[PDB]
Enzyme design. Structure first.
Site, short mmCIF file in Angstrom:
data_model
loop_
_atom_site.label_atom_id
_atom_site.label_comp_id
_atom_site.label_asym_id
_atom_site.label_seq_id
_atom_site.Cartn_x
_atom_site.Cartn_y
_atom_site.Cartn_z
N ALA A 1 36.24 82.65 46.18
CA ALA A 1 35.44 84.14 45.50
C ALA A 1 34.90 85.13 46.31
O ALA A 1 33.93 84.98 45.92
CB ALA A 1 34.76 83.13 44.61
N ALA A 2 35.91 85.27 46.78
CA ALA A 2 35.18 86.24 48.19
C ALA A 2 35.09 87.82 48.27
O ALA A 2 34.17 87.61 48.41
CB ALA A 2 36.79 85.94 49.52
N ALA A 3 35.62 88.41 47.27
CA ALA A 3 35.42 89.69 47.01
C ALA A 3 33.50 89.46 46.54
O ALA A 3 33.48 88.94 45.97
CB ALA A 3 36.44 89.99 45.66
N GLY B 1 31.28 90.14 51.16
CA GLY B 1 29.89 90.35 52.03
C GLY B 1 29.74 88.52 52.80
O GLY B 1 29.59 89.03 54.35
N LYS B 2 29.98 87.10 52.45
CA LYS B 2 29.95 86.29 53.63
C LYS B 2 31.28 86.05 54.14
O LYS B 2 30.74 85.76 55.01
CB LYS B 2 29.58 85.33 52.42
CG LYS B 2 28.40 84.93 51.17
CD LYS B 2 28.38 83.85 50.47
CE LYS B 2 27.46 84.60 50.01
NZ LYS B 2 27.68 85.10 48.34
N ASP C 1 40.63 86.05 45.94
CA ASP C 1 40.23 86.39 44.64
C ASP C 1 40.87 87.34 43.54
O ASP C 1 42.38 87.35 43.72
CB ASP C 1 39.02 87.62 44.71
CG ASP C 1 38.24 87.96 43.41
OD1 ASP C 1 38.05 88.55 42.57
OD2 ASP C 1 36.76 87.24 43.73
N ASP D 1 31.42 80.97 46.83
CA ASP D 1 30.45 81.47 46.13
C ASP D 1 30.56 81.27 44.49
O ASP D 1 31.26 82.40 43.87
CB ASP D 1 30.40 82.47 46.72
CG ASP D 1 29.12 83.84 45.68
OD1 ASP D 1 27.59 82.63 45.35
OD2 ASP D 1 28.98 84.87 45.75
N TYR E 1 32.64 76.25 33.15
CA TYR E 1 33.88 76.98 33.75
C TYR E 1 33.80 77.16 35.38
O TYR E 1 35.17 76.70 35.84
CB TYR E 1 34.11 78.47 33.82
CG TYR E 1 34.90 79.46 34.27
CD1 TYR E 1 36.05 79.36 34.01
CD2 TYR E 1 34.21 80.17 35.42
CE1 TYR E 1 36.78 80.54 34.56
CE2 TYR E 1 34.63 80.90 35.90
CZ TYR E 1 36.58 81.77 35.27
OH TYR E 1 37.38 82.35 36.03
N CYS F 1 23.69 82.52 42.40
CA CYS F 1 22.84 83.49 42.15
C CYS F 1 22.32 83.51 40.97
O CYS F 1 21.78 84.38 39.83
CB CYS F 1 23.26 85.52 42.65
SG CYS F 1 24.79 85.81 41.85
#
Length: 384
Positions: free
Chosen positions: A205-207, A210-211, A229, A273, A300, A323
């Site tokens: 879940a890269a976009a 940031g990480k 993504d 993430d 989900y 988050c």
């Protein structure tokens, strides 16, 4: 401040943290982060050199003793009381523009929903969001007419925002890719993953990256990071970010990551993430999401989690992060992992809180750690 949170969610928080804690969390949740963190892009610059560049622009960056690649700015505010009733004509900003004004941004014309018709340029005005939240005070740079008709341009020069965070997008240092705005718990997530040059690494879940770019600079642009993504548009922005940061480490792939094992790849390190209810993000002017969303999203996420576990080598490592503050999406979905051959490991960096009835996971709370609500779980795959 309690009104920003639906009744059932408030009860949920009281039941999960205790009334007193829950009231401290929701209170801080409405405010922006007290320490605004950026990541030093060590691919291009050292931390101390960057500090020199930032001080040139009159900025006051502070060093993190825990993260050598971490700098933060101290938040100014509040600049007026919560009950302050300014004797001013009202400008109503839409949802998004109000949030940015709340943190120090100017108010531009497309951000203007409606306004008091007596407003002429140079008038002192108060800015409110569509629900009446006072978010800032300033000076109109447009007449009423131009304010509700323009497509661009400065509408209200915000001279007294409720809170002030530094704007960093417009700096040379940013355009040169010297840093990337990223939260302290997000940075901890990437460290705790402990990427190696040999590791097959997937950020499912890269976009917006940031990480991903964090892992990149940790690998020192060595090896390969697969970044996934859903939409290519989100990846388009990410390509821009990667370019700017001088990252040469990442391979982009567009796909539904829930079908991840469709690739012929067994990874060593996987960062999930996971898309979440975002109950912990700051500032939280009004919380829209609620109990029904927690359950649905928690369900989900399990498809991502299960995909991840099947794509992991024996002895592989998964870092799961959100988050959000809910139990179901965090401690609950880790128990799901533990039933599926995953083991909890100690994390290299632990500066947050312990989990809910759970020992090796790490949480962040806004009132305790001056961050967003965050969750970090590091797991080791012991068997299929």
């Amino acid at each position: 401040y309690l009104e920003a949170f639906p009744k059932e969610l408030r009860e949920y928080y009281k039941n999960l943290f205790g009334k007193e804690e829950a009231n401290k969390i929701m209170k801080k949740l409405r405010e922006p982060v007290e320490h605004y963190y950026i990541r030093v892009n060590t691919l291009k610059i050292s931390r101390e050199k960057l500090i020199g560049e930032l001080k040139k622009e009159g900025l006051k960056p502070l060093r993190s003793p825990y993260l050598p690649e971490g700098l933060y700015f101290v938040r100014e505010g509040p600049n007026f009381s919560d009950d302050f009733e300014p004797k001013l004509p009202v400008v109503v900003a839409n949802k998004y523009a109000a949030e940015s004004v709340y943190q120090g941004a100017m108010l531009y014309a497309p951000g203007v929903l409606k306004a008091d018709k007596n407003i002429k340029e140079g008038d002192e005005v108060q800015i409110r969001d569509p629900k009446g939240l006072l978010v800032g005070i300033g000076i109109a740079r447009m007449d009423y007419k131009e304010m509700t008709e323009a497509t661009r341009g400065l509408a209200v020069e915000v001279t007294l925002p409720k809170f002030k965070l530094p704007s960093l997008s417009e700096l040379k240092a940013f355009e040169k890719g010297y840093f990337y705005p990223q939260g302290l718990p997000s940075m901890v997530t990437a460290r705790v993953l402990e990427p190696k040059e040999d590791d097959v690494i997937i950020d499912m879940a890269a976009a917006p990256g940031g990480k991903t770019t964090h892992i990149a600079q940790l690998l020192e642009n060595k090896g390969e990071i697969i970044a996934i993504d859903k939409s290519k548009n989100r990846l388009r922005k990410m390509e821009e970010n990667i370019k700017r940061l001088g990252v040469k480490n990442v391979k982009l792939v567009q796909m539904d990551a829930r079908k991840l094992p469709d690739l012929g790849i067994k990874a060593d390190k996987i960062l999930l993430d996971a898309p979440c209810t975002a109950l912990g993000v700051r500032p939280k002017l009004w919380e829209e999401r609620t109990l029904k969303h927690i359950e649905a999203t928690a369900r989900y996420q399990r498809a991502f989690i299960w995909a991840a576990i099947k794509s992991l080598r024996r002895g592989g490592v998964l870092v799961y992060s959100t988050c959000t503050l809910s139990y179901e999406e965090n401690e609950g979905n880790v128990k799901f992992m533990i039933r599926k051959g995953m083991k909890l490991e100690e994390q290299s960096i632990f500066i947050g809180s312990p989990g809910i009835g759970m020992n090796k996971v790490q949480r962040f709370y806004p009132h305790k750690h001056l961050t967003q609500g965050f969750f970090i779980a590091k797991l080791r795959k012991v068997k299929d």
